Amino acid sequence: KLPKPFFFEEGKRAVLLLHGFTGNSSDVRQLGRFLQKKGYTSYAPQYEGHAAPPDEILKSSPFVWFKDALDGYDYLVEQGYDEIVVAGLSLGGDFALKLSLNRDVKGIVTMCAPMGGKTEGAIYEGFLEYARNFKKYEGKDQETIDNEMDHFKPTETLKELSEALDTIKEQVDEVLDPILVIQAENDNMIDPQSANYIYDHVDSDDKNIKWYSESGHVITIDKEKEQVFEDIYQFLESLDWSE
Ligand SMILES: [Ca+2]
Ligand SMILES: [Ca+2]
Ligand SMILES: [Ca+2]
Ligand SMILES: [Ca+2]
């Protein structure tokens, strides 16, 4: 079965966990379980068309995915959690920054978040590989996979993604809330210098950047995830919770 949103309820301090483009809640589930062990509630929404056949992404848009993130914040509030940190991986880190401008958060965590909308190379190739792997997961024979990929047209989706990222980069200077910026030094999906851009251009009064030298882009599931989780916990413990 494909992943679904999760909601791990513990104490009154809550974390909204946002996944990346073509990702899903499985990329943040271990972080959610760690946060639960430490007493924090977490909710991980999923973007429209994700955890589903890749054509559903082509029929959706980043505009909807950001609304899915906002809906996740609003779901936490409806469920009784008013004090929320937003933590996002990759595109979700961009959405975490933008969400902080649209909803009241106690803090922001960005994890390998890109700055700017370059899609040529790694993002484009990653999306095609995601689609090919999904069709093999569907049990399709090789001729069917090959022919469907000949007709898979990601250009409009990647253009929308690029424009959404460009817009968020121009909003970074509006960010005010406490922030932890996390980045893998050896990221082969985005420019790791994005992390310096975020750190230097937010207007937050409380900021920290952490680099990890042995992790790849999906840092929440890779070889240093335990240290990443501990660094997130120490950030959360430093914030202005009412309880
Ligand atoms: Ca409830
Ligand atoms: Ca600006
Ligand atoms: Ca300032
Ligand atoms: Ca701090």
Author numbering: 4 to 246
Question: What are the paper's exact sentences on this?
Answer:
Here, we provide the first characterization of S. aureus FphH, a conserved, putative carboxylesterase (referred to as yvaK in Bacillus subtilis) at the molecular and cellular level. Biochemical and structural investigations revealed that FphH acts as an esterase and lipase based on a fold well suited to act on a small to long hydrophobic unbranched lipid group within its substrate and can be inhibited by active site-targeting oxadiazoles. FphH is a member of the α/β hydrolase superfamily illustrated by the well conserved core structure of seven β-strands connected by several helices. The FphH serine hydrolase catalytic triad consists of Ser93, His220, and Asp190 in the usual H-bonding arrangement for this fold to enable the serine residue to cleave substrates that bind to the surrounding active site pockets.
We cloned the full length fphH sequence (SAUSA300_ 0763) using USA300 genomic DNA as a template into a pET28a vector for recombinant expression of the full-length 28 kD enzyme in E. coli, examined behavior in solution, and determined crystallization conditions. FphH crystallized in several different conditions spanning at least three different crystal forms. These crystal forms were very similar and always showed the same monomeric structure, with oligomer analysis in PISA34 also suggesting no oligomer formation in solution. FphH crystals diffracted to higher resolution in the presence of calcium atoms with final models showing Calcium binding on the surface of FphH, especially at crystal contact sites. FphH also contains a well-defined acyl binding pocket that is very hydrophobic, consisting of residues Phe24, Leu94, Pro117, Ile126, Leu168, Met192 and Ile193. In contrast to FphF, FphH is able to accommodate a longer chain in the narrow hydrophobic extension beyond the core acyl binding pocket. The leaving group pocket is not as well-defined, showing a large surface exposed area that is capped about 9 Å away from Ser93 by Asp30. The other sides are defined by the mainchain of Gly23/Gly26 and the side chains of Leu92 and Val221. It is unclear what functional group the leaving group pocket could accommodate from the unbound FphH structure. Helix 125–140 hovers above the active site pockets. The structure suggests that the lid is observed in an intermediate to open state, with Ala125 and Gly129 potentially closing the hydrophobic acyl pocket and Tyr133 interacting with the leaving group in the putative closed state.
